[PDB]
Amino acid sequence: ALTQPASVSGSLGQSITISCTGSSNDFGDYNYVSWYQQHPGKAPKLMIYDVDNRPSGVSNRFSGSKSGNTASLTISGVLAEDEADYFCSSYTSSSTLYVFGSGTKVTVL
Amino acid sequence: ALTQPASVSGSLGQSITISCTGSSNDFGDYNYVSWYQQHPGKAPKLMIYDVDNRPSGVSNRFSGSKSGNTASLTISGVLAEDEADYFCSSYTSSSTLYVFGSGTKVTVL
C-alpha cells in the first residue's frame, strides 16, 4: 500500500509537495516510483518516472525526489491547470505492472 | 495514444465490452495491454494484465481479449459497483513510458 495525503491546497506561484509512503523496502531501496497527473475524468498522464525523470513536453515545474520509505512530487510555480488528482506508483512484486498510491487531490487557489 | 469510447452504459446482469485501439503499430501487437478500474478520486485497480490475465481477488465477470490493434475488456453480469472509469494501459514500444488510454465512463442503470 503506497499512502499519499488525501488532499493538499496551494496558491498560484507557490510550491506544493505530495508525499508517497510505503511499508516494504523493495521500492525504498531500488527507486522504481512514478507520478501521474489525472485531470478529473481524463487519462492519467505520466509526469515523473524512476523517482526524478520527466518525459519530453512536461514542465520542469514538476520534479520528483526520494528519501528511503517516502517519495515526493514537488510542483513549483503552481498554475491553475495543476489542479488535478496525483498518484504515485511502483511495480508489483517480481513484475513490471504498476500498483497505484491512494492519490492526492490538489486544489489551486 | 490508446483511444477508447468516451462512455458506455449497461443494465444490471447484462454484458459490457470496452474497446482499446492504438495509433499505427506503436504498442508491440497489443500483447501487453492491461485494464484498470477507477472509482472517482480513487486509486486505479488492476482488473486485467497481458490482455487476458486476472489478478487474485478480481471477479471472473471481468475478462480481456485482443484482435489486431484492438484490446477489449468485457464485464459480465454487470453489478452496481462496476459503475467506474476504465482505462486500458501499456508500455510505449520503447518499454519506458507506461501510457493510459483515453478512458471509458461505465454507467450502470
Author numbering:
A (entry chain A), B (entry chain B): 5 to 113
Question: Could you give the paper's own sentences about this structure?
Answer:
The primary structure of the pathogenic LC, named Pat-1, was deduced from the sequence of the complementary DNA (cDNA) of the plasma cell clone that caused AL amyloidosis. The two sequences differ in 11 point mutations, all located in the VL domain. We thus conclude that the Pat-1 VL but not Pat-1 LC is the disease-relevant amyloidogenic species. The crystal structure of Pat-1 showed that V81 is in close proximity to L15 and L82 opposite of the antigen-binding site. Focusing on the surface properties in this region, we found that these three amino acids form a hydrophobic surface patch which is not present in the WT-1 protein. In contrast, in the patient mutant L15 interacts with three amino acids located in FR3, including the two other point mutations in the hydrophobic surface spot, and two residues in the C-terminal region (V111 and L112). V81 in Pat-1 forms six hydrophobic interactions with residues in FR2 and FR3, two of them, the L15 and L82 point mutations, are located within this hydrophobic surface area. However, V81 contacts only one amino acid in the C-terminal segment (V111). Remarkably, when we performed fibril formation assays, we found that all Pat-1 point mutants except V81L formed amyloids, suggesting that valine at position 81 is the main cause for the pathogenicity of Pat-1.
The LCs are composed of an N-terminal variable (VL) and a constant domain (CL). Even though full length LCs and other proteins have recently been found as part of fibrils, patient biopsies predominantly revealed VL domains that result from proteolytic cleavage of the LC as the main constituent of amyloid deposits. The patient variant (referred to as Pat-1) contains 11 mutations in the VL domain compared to the corresponding germline sequence (referred to as WT-1). To determine potential structural differences between the two VL variants Pat-1 and WT-1, the X-ray structure of both proteins were solved to 2.5 Å (Pat-1) and to 1.55 Å (WT-1) resolutions.
